[PDB]
Design an enzyme around this catalytic site. Structure first.
Site, PDB file in Angstrom:
ATOM      1  N   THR A 105       0.968  -1.344   0.128  1.00 37.58           N
ATOM      2  CA  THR A 105       0.056  -0.068  -0.243  1.00 37.58           C
ATOM      3  C   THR A 105       0.823   1.294  -0.028  1.00 37.58           C
ATOM      4  O   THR A 105       1.792   1.082   0.658  1.00 37.58           O
ATOM      5  CB  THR A 105      -0.831   0.191   1.291  1.00 37.58           C
ATOM      6  OG1 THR A 105      -1.795  -1.147   1.262  1.00 37.58           O
ATOM      7  CG2 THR A 105      -1.918   1.136   1.488  1.00 37.58           C
ATOM      8  N   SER A 106       0.401   2.485  -0.723  1.00 38.82           N
ATOM      9  CA  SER A 106       1.109   3.482  -0.835  1.00 38.82           C
ATOM     10  C   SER A 106      -0.089   4.589  -0.853  1.00 38.82           C
ATOM     11  O   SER A 106      -0.744   4.620  -1.911  1.00 38.82           O
ATOM     12  CB  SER A 106       1.854   3.857  -1.943  1.00 38.82           C
ATOM     13  OG  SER A 106       2.951   2.756  -2.464  1.00 38.82           O
ATOM     14  N   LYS A 120      -9.022   2.493  -1.348  1.00 40.23           N
ATOM     15  CA  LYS A 120      -8.314   2.619  -0.225  1.00 40.23           C
ATOM     16  C   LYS A 120      -8.505   4.036   0.489  1.00 40.23           C
ATOM     17  O   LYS A 120      -8.251   4.259   1.751  1.00 40.23           O
ATOM     18  CB  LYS A 120      -6.951   2.447  -0.105  1.00 40.23           C
ATOM     19  CG  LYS A 120      -6.287   1.179  -0.735  1.00 40.23           C
ATOM     20  CD  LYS A 120      -4.995   0.984  -0.711  1.00 40.23           C
ATOM     21  CE  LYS A 120      -4.450  -0.263  -1.276  1.00 40.23           C
ATOM     22  NZ  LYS A 120      -3.183  -0.529  -1.225  1.00 40.23           N
ATOM     23  N   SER A 148       3.388   0.467   3.000  1.00 35.73           N
ATOM     24  CA  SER A 148       4.520  -0.071   2.628  1.00 35.73           C
ATOM     25  C   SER A 148       5.650   0.418   1.797  1.00 35.73           C
ATOM     26  O   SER A 148       6.638   0.557   1.831  1.00 35.73           O
ATOM     27  CB  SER A 148       4.439  -1.477   2.230  1.00 35.73           C
ATOM     28  OG  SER A 148       3.661  -1.745   1.225  1.00 35.73           O
ATOM     29  N   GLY A 149       4.894   1.009   0.820  1.00 40.38           N
ATOM     30  CA  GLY A 149       5.517   1.821  -0.236  1.00 40.38           C
ATOM     31  C   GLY A 149       6.115   3.080   0.018  1.00 40.38           C
ATOM     32  O   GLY A 149       7.036   3.902  -0.748  1.00 40.38           O
TER      33      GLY A 149
END
Ligand SMILES: *[C@@H](CS(C)(=O)=O)[C@H](Cc1ccc(CN)cc1)NC(=O)[C@@H](NC(=O)[C@H](CC(C)C)NC(=O)[C@@H](Cc1ccccc1)N=[N+]=[N-])[C@@H](C)O
Ligand SMILES: *[C@@H](CS(C)(=O)=O)[C@H](Cc1ccc(CN)cc1)NC(=O)[C@@H](NC(=O)[C@H](CC(C)C)NC(=O)[C@@H](Cc1ccccc1)N=[N+]=[N-])[C@@H](C)O
Ligand SMILES: [Mg+2]
Ligand SMILES: [Mg+2]
Ligand SMILES: [Mg+2]
Ligand SMILES: [Mg+2]
Lengths: 195, 224, 212, 196, 204, 222, 219, 195, 196
Positions: D1-2, D33, D129-130
């Protein structure tokens, strides 16, 4: 193997050793002699892990019998015990150690003295008036502390030993099927056939 | 015993009437990090064999050198190195299969799944799989890791059994492979758009295609 | 598994079951748990199937080399110790072996040695080894005496395996009997427990815990 | 996910990728999201999908009930409700939430709530995470009081890089613009952002 | 350690033409030790039969529980419970212990008294219903029974044909399992007669 | 941690006739829930009228079969092209298997052929080489589904003669090659229906005095 | 298990295989995995079968009571919420993995619900051990606003992919087509495998089994 | 606690139960009665974890004695066993389960029949002609399989029981210090004081 | 640690921070992580200090002995020796090494050797714990055939960001320039790079 006792009196050493051989749930034998004659005046009782016990005892026996032939001479009980201790002390740092505890009861023909050596699987040697291995000592040593005298006869030694075995038969959980008793004196080694 | 560090994903392949096709993307993942975008994972051996490798990239590079070294060694005292005594796909495979099983049996595996695709001397299609455990199998379609789950289902609709191989042309087979690579790019989190494809045909020989891309991508339904 | 062997007036009786398991999976009910090492030597197998079959076959080869080298039948005491000294070398590696080496020679008379994978080697008159040893011991110990005939000894051995075949889940199939005497061993049949049980029940009037 | 939220002159913009993975399998490649808790208070979700969905639904409920009684809640109030849930249930949650909203008084505001349940008010925020791969880029390229077109390009370039390097991120770049003018949804496909 | 294979045993049920059959072994053990050869695993509540394999304390407990529940059912409904209805009751009852289940493998068998339709069903330990027409198997030799049933079974068997099919399926499966056997029982169930037969089998 | 073993599924079946033997196996190779191949042969002609299969972990199976085939080749070289008898093959395999006693070949091995009297023979091995001659043996994934059926239909277990009621057993009449092949096919059809790892194809190798013949049959592919 | 769903022009097409397994063994070759929630909403089920069954029944029961009180058809979002909030509460211990599809007053909706309580709203979804095989078919051939018979074929084709390529999946293909004008529950839609034919009759003749005692009781 | 046996003959039930109480290395007592009279014609022997055994036995005794007073009636052995099983079956899913195994030997005065129930700590009840708990059965069941008949007298039952205890004394590793034997018949419960 | 090597028009430049930490304690704040294996072949070291020092010393030995016999080794040859050590001893090493060198024939070359022992030839390479934060920045800002001043600024800005965000990185930015002209050592202090 379970109970092995020893007592050094005036003129002899007496070794008592249980007859039971138990694997798991079943008592496989009730007449097992947990001893080897190393030389005519030196007897070694033993107890510990299955297989290792006899393999070690027979290995020691073979080496002492070889020494006896080579030199046409019997090693002193002190010398045999020091040999045995070194073998165990070597063993403990091996890939697979011998899990065997022993008592060496011998009559020194030079000094005219009985001698009892107690050696554990680590190679921890002690000369004693009376000795035991495993849980046996927890019950028996207090009796022997009370009743033992250095000037006892062989018959008094056997009576004191009966009192030890009765206490073990009363208070120990495992049925060890009685003991084979052997006397080591100036005349050699003999088995008390009624006990 | 180790753990794989820099990794390659799916290698996919199938048989068609005259030969075999094999393909693999150009990515070297470092866990979740898409680290290296220019990694070639199809490694040709002569003009009749392509070895496609997935899994640990350092171990792939080792195998690449073993194959390069195998070509050199076969040429030694061999006047027919470019003819009757050239390396066959079946020879190259059996060697790798021997190595892979030997290494697992010393508890020190080459952390890979390999597909050897090629065409034999007599024109027969060769396609066989081997992995880090030394497990080997052949099938009209073969795919490693992720592609086994998503590529094989699509490729098996073209060649479902042996008797479908003569009915499948190189155009149909190549379309199916390129279509399967698109599906893998949508759904494999450790894949990339850029890939390489290799056709080994019994008539037209080895054709090696670099810098291909997944195209015709359906995203328009996302906006809703 | 249930294997037994005992000494009596007229030789040695050896009886075994015939079942092999892989957990609760009855893999076979026609298994040979006795190896005939020579005309005068027998070996029984309990514990691991391979470890017994292999090393007791190998024992037979080592017993042959002894009698070639020495022009004399190997003693039971020596045969049993080849095997005990072998397993002791592999001690801690996870061999699973509970065995009995039964035979006759002029030197020692009829003899039985118990040998197991953790090094123990024991001479004796009665032994039962296997997951059903306790069941066999029960019947055997309570009907035993030196006195026994060869007919009664054979039956008692047959019956003591039946006993264990019934109660022990991992024992059963059939009973293989052997009689060892001064002249050698003699096979006394393969007795399927399927039929033996109902016959023994009817004829003996025992097994009243059962519906039949 | 970013995911990210960036304040600018006229308000705030939220941005996110669309990839949801189960290990290496992309379960959903068109995930939304960016979720709405009020008219002009939205949040970017990262962490456990079940947890962030459960939280966002509870927040929406609390702010709906707040609005019934006390009128439009501030962006700070929304962030406080998110925080209260995340902090008090920190042992059972895996949620990294950015809260973004437009008042007329306060204009654009961005609050980030990382794993602990702490709150941090910032000019812009990145998460998921990104985000690790774009700390450098975002710090160098962010300015305050950017125009709408500049902020859309700043988010587009940033998440483009986050997507490029993070395997857990990918698919379309969704954005949600929050200004006085209203609520605008934007989408940007791979063919557009990959060539940047 | 594994509760479903401490005590051992098996149950199988089949459908035939206007009939059902349910059968079980008689063993109860403590792993290797055989304890009882009179431990029946089939019970009945009116005309609905219930076989239960698994942990024996739970077999007994569940029997007592379904007797309890079906007795109250009959008092309130003024009629005996039907197989279809009982199956749902078993499923409910098992699932209400979802996170502390009874370690059992129940099997329902019976004929619907109104429609006349033969009915069988099986369940996992938390109550998911296996609703198969042909046959239902359960216990420590379930794999063995699946193999026997799949090759021996065919539809619409007459009561005494079906008896030979289910009996051979049970007996030959049990003889390949260490923890099953020690006797067996077969119920042949028709719309208004039930034949209970004890089988002769090897006692090892 | 590296696990050197795997499970490739599969199911095999050996049956010994009076003057023949069969060794059958499904042609499906799997890992977990995936099919690797719908046709990967598992039962092999090893020469000297011996057929062999090493079912379980396919790598260990291939390794063992390869080593035995080579053992046959070197038996010819070392003993003047003598035919390796099925009993001798079996003992040789025990030693191959036991040789890796402390890192086993994770396989259930079965061989089939004819004994030295011309009669049908099947031998069955555990992973560490305990073995025995058997009339009937299924191995692998669905062996528990197949063996009870073979006890019932081959050996006539729990079968008695109608009218006698348990007193007289059904006699053990000999089965023809056509009869045995019916049992093999139906065993695999049943196993295919009830086990997820069994399917795709069945390959049967038949050994007689005339040599080794093959037959192939389709199996259900889901 | 291979369960799938698509949103087409007029509504929703759900699909499922029919294999119920217990480890490697197939207990039922024709079991129902498409469950009824309400007259306009159905639910395909994968994961732990008992959990799947009982979770759908409970939410179906509660929606029936909800719908009786409100007097109007239930919505897919309320089915989705009730499943979602329950599964979340149990933190994944209820191993229900659902494809929820139905048609509302607000149009057709399709959801995937996971054991931990997350839900995705999508035009196409797949779940179970055969999800990757089925998803490959959807990534290959799906397009938005398909006609009915086309969507039926795509779902059927996706379930088939699972049936053949996944060992956990098998048996027949069930479909459920849901639109404003109808509900078509097609069981079975296709029979892609014939039952294997047996060459011998192994059934024993009467009197073959050995009986000890007999008892007959009438009813 | 270790060995508890039971045997149902023609007209009585006989329970034999070991006397040893051992904690660890020491035999604390050699005269322990591992039984409680639940009612005049129902006796329960027990064995299992220390503390739990007596606590459970006494708790059951209290409940049956309460029932006896309330109804002025003796519950059948079948009823008492079903009560006990339910208590154990309830116990097994508790916070801390009773680790106790029991034999209930009773004479049903209504049916004029002896009855023996064996129940383990899980609540696994079985009616038997003869029963045991723990390792005892492994030795004894094969003897009882051989020698038992349903029409045996009480003296024949005691002789068959001696043969069981002798076999246990021969082949079991633990010294259980003999057994207390009790007979349950139409006239009630009595202890055989010489065994 | 934050390390990088970047090829440019006239050759290659290596760059590194100077922080070495034992947990949260900065054991050495003036570490020299750019180590010389040959005249114009250097390496950037990351991972176990003991391992990378041991390796670099062995490589220096191998290339010294190569030079004695066969003359100046190629940068590729140096990378192959590093690889051989790292790959064959992967189970006992934790070394992430960038190798950079200047030939006259090949000009500037950069080889990266990550944990596995694989080799990757690249135009530029980044590595160490701080590298995660600058993937985005470096990808956006790198061009091929930059001038010396542009490449010094590219490395200075990049490591500045790596240092800013990574606690394991810090101190001075050291650089080593490798061209035909020779070997130039550069140093840049916090007061210079922090204000960028
Ligand atoms: C009974 C001994 S018991 C129950 O332990 O008291 C029998 C004795 C016996 C003696 C000789 C022979 C000769 N063939 C057979 C049996 N022992 C067993 O039943 C043992 N079983 C096994 O060894 C089985 C044998 C197969 C043929 C069923 N194999 C296994 O248990 C494992 C071996 C294995 C090895 C490496 C990796 C995995 C498994 N097999 N499988 N499959 C006793 C241990 O059950
Ligand atoms: C496929 C699901 S998967 C593994 O994702 O592909 C099917 C879906 C499904 C849905 C509904 C129904 C019927 N209502 C059937 C199948 N799931 C399964 O097949 C599961 N199998 C089971 O749950 C079986 C059911 C029995 C009746 C065959 N039960 C068991 O395997 C366990 C039950 C259990 C489950 C969880 C925890 C503990 C026990 N056994 N028993 N006994 C899937 C789990 O295989
Ligand atoms: Mg038995
Ligand atoms: Mg990406
Ligand atoms: Mg059985
Ligand atoms: Mg199948």
């Amino acid at each position: 193997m379970d109970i092995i006792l020893g007592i050094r009196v005036q003129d002899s050493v007496i070794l008592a050793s249980s007859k039971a051989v138990t694997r798991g749930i079943s008592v496989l034998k009730d007449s097992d002699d947990k001893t080897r004659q190393l030389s005519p005046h030196t007897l070694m009782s033993f107890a510990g892990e299955a297989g290792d016990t006899v393999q070690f005892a027979e290995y020691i026996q073979a080496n002492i019998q070889l020494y006896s032939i080579r030199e046409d001479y019997e090693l002193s009980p002190q010398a045999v015990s020091s040999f045995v201790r070194q073998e165990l002390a070597k063993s403990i740092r091996s890939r697979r150690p011998y899990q065997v505890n022993v008592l060496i009861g011998g009559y020194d023909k030079k000094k005219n003295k009985p001698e009892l050596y107690q050696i554990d699987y680590l190679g921890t040697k002690v000369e004693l008036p009376y000795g035991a291995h495993g849980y046996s000592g927890f019950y028996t040593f207090s009796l022997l502390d009370h009743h033992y005298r250095p000037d006892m006869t062989t018959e008094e030694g056997l009576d004191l030993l009966k009192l030890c075995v009765q206490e073990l038969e009363k208070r120990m959980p495992m049925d060890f099927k009685g003991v084979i008793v052997k006397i080591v004196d100036k005349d050699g080694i003999r088995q008390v056939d009624d006990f | 015993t180790q753990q794989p560090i820099v990794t390659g994903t799916s290698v996919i392949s199938m048989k068609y009437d005259n030969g075999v096709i094999i393909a693999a993307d150009n990515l070297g993942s470092y866990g979740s990090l898409l680290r290296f975008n220019g990694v070639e994972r199809l490694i040709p051996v002569g003009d009749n064999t392509v070895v496609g490798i997935s899994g640990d990239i350092s171990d792939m590079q080792h195998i690449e050198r073993l194959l390069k070294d195998l070509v050199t060694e076969n040429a030694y005292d061999n006047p027919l190195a470019d003819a009757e005594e050239a390396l066959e796909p079946s020879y190259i495979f059996e060697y790798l299969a021997t190595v892979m099983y030997q290494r697992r049996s010393k508890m020190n595996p080459l952390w890979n799944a390999i597909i050897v695709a090629g065409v034999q001397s007599n024109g027969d299609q060769f396609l066989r799989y081997v992995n880090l455990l030394g497990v080997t199998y052949s099938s009209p379609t073969l795919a490693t890791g992720f592609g086994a789950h998503m590529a094989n289902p699509l490729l098996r609709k073209v060649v479902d059994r042996e008797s479908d191989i003569p009915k499948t042309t190189v155009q149909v087979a190549e379309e199916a492979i390129v279509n399967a690579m698109r599906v893998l790019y949508y759904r494999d989190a450790r894949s990339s758009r850029n890939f390489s494809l290799a056709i080994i045909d019994k008539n037209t020989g080895l054709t090696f295609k670099k810098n291909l891309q997944v195209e015709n991508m359906k995203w328009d339904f996302a906006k809703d | 598994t249930t294997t037994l062997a005992f000494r009596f007036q007229g030789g040695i009786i050896v009886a075994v079951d015939s079942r092999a398991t892989a957990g609760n999976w009855v893999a076979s009910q026609t298994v040979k748990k006795v190896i005939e090492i020579n005309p005068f030597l027998l070996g029984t197998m309990a514990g691991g199937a391979a470890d017994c079959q292999f090393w007791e076959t190998w024992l037979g080869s080592q017993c042959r080399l002894h009698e070639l080298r020495e022009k004399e039948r190997i003693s039971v005491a020596a045969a049993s110790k080849i095997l005990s000294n072998l397993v002791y070398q592999y001690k801690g590696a996870g061999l699973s072996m509970g065995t009995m080496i039964c035979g006759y020679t002029r030197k020692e008379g009829p003899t039985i040695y118990y040998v197991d994978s953790d090094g123990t080697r024991l001479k004796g008159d009665i032994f039962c080894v296997g997951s059903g040893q306790t069941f066999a011991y029960g019947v055997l110990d309570s009907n035993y005496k030196w006195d026994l005939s060869v007919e009664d000894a054979l039956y008692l051995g047959k019956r003591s395996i039946l006993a264990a075949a019934h109660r022990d889940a991992y024992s059963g199939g059939s009973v293989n009997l052997y009689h060892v005497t001064e002249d050698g061993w003699i096979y006394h049949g393969n007795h399927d427990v399927g039929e033996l049980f109902w016959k023994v029940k009817e004829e003996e009037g025992s097994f009243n815990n059962v519906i039949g | 996910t970013s995911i990210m939220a960036v304040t600018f002159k006229d308000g705030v913009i939220l941005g996110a990728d669309s990839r949801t993975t189960t290990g290496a399998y992309i379960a959903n490649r068109v995930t939304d999201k960016l979720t709405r808790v009020h008219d002009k208070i939205w949040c970017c979700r990262s962490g456990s999908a079940a947890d962030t969905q459960a939280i966002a639904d509870i927040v929406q409920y609390h702010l709906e009930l707040y609005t019934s009684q006390y009128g439009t809640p501030s962006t700070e109030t929304a962030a406080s409700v998110f925080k209260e849930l995340c902090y008090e249930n920190k042992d059972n949650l895996t949620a990294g939430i950015i809260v973004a909203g437009y008042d007329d008084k306060n204009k654009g505001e961005v609050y980030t709530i990382p794993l602990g349940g702490s709150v941090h008010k910032l000019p812009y925020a990145i998460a998921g995470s990104g985000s690790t791969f774009i700390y450098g880029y975002c710090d160098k390229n962010f300015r305050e009081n950017m125009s709408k077109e500049e902020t859309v390009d700043f988010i587009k370039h940033s998440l483009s890089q986050a997507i490029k390097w993070d395997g857990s991120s990918g698919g379309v770049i969704r954005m949600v613009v929050l200004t006085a003018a209203g609520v605008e949804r934007l989408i940007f496909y791979p063919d557009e952002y990959e060539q940047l | 350690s594994d509760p479903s294979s401490i005590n051992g045993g098996i149950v199988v049920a089949m459908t035939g033409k206007d009939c059902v059959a349910i059968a079980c072994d008689l063993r109860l053990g403590s792993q290797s030790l055989g304890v009882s050869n009179k431990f029946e695993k089939i019970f009945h509540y009116g005309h609905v039969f219930l076989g239960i394999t698994g942990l024996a304390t739970d077999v007994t407990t569940l029997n007592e529980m379904f007797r309890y529940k079906t007795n109250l059912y009959k008092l309130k409904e003024e009629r005996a419970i039907e197989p279809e209805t009982f199956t749902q009751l078993v499923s409910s009852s098992l699932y209400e212990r979802r996170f502390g289940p009874y370690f059992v493998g129940p099997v329902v068998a019976g004929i619907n008294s109104k429609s006349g339709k033969p009915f069988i069903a099986g369940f996992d330990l938390i109550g998911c219903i296996d609703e198969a027409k042909d046959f239902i198997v359960s216990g420590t030799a379930s794999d063995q029974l699946f193999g026997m049933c799949e090759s021996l079974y065919e539809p619409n068997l007459e009561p005494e044909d079906l008896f030979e099919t289910i009996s051979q399926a049970l007996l030959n499966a049990a003889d390949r399992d260490a923890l099953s056997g020690w006797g067996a029982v077969v119920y042949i169930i028709k719309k208004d007669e039930v034949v209970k037969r004890y089988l002769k089998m090897r006692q090892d | 941690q590296f696990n050197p073993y795997g499970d490739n599924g599969g199911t095999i079946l050996g049956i010994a006739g009076e003057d023949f033997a069969v060794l059958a196996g499904d042609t499906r190779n799997i890992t977990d829930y995936s099919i690797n191949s719908r046709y990967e042969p598992k039962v092999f002609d090893c020469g000297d009228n011996i057929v062999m299969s090493a079912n379980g972990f396919a790598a260990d199976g291939d390794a063992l079969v390869k080593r035995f085939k080579n053992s046959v080749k070197w038996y010819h070289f070392d003993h003047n092209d003598k035919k390796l008898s099925i009993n001798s093959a079996a003992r040789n395999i025990q030693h191959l298997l036991y040789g890796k006693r402390f890192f086993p070949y994770y396989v259930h091995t079965i061989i089939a052929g004819l004994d030295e009297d011309g009669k049908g023979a099947v031998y069955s091995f555990d992973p560490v080489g305990s073995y025995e001659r058997e009339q009937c043996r299924a191995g692998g994934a669905a062996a528990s589904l197949i063996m009870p059926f073979l006890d019932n239909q081959v050996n006539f277990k729990n079968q008695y003669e109608p009218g006698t009621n348990g007193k007289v057993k059904k006699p053990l009449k000999y089965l023809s090659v056509e009869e045995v092949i019916k049992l093999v096919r139906d065993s695999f059809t049943s196993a295919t229906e009830r086990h997820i790892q069994v399917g795709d194809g069945l390959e049967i190798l038949i050994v007689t005095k005339d040599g080794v013949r093959k037959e192939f049959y389709e199996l259900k592919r889901d | 298990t291979t369960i799938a769903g698509v949103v087409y022009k007029d509504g929703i097409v759900l699909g499922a295989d029919t294999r119920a397994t217990e480890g490697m063994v197939v207990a039922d070759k024709n079991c129902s995995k498409i469950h009824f929630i309400s007259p306009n909403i159905y639910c395909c089920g994968a994961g732990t079968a008992a959990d799947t069954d009982m979770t759908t029944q409970l939410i179906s029961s509660n929606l029936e009571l909800h719908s009786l009180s409100t007097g109007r058809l239930p919505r897919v979002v309320t089915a989705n919420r009730m499943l979602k909030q329950m599964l979340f509460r149990y933190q994944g211990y209820i191993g229900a993995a659902l494809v929820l599809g139905g048609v509302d007053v607000t149009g057709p909706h399709l959801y995937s619900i996971y054991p931990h309580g997350s839900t995705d709203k999508l035009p196409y979804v797949t779940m179970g051990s055969g999800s990757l095989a089925a998803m490959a078919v959807f990534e290959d051939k799906f397009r938005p606003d398909m006609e009915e018979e086309e969507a039926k074929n795509l779902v059927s084709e996706a379930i088939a992919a699972g049936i053949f390529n996944d060992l956990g999946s098998g048996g027949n293909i069930d479909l459920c087509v849901i639109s404003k004008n109808k509900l078509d529950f097609l069981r079975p839609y296709t029979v892609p495998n014939k039952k294997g034919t047996r060459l011998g009759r192994y059934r024993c003749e009467k009197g073959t089994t050995a009986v000890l005692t007999e008892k007959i009781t009438p009813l």
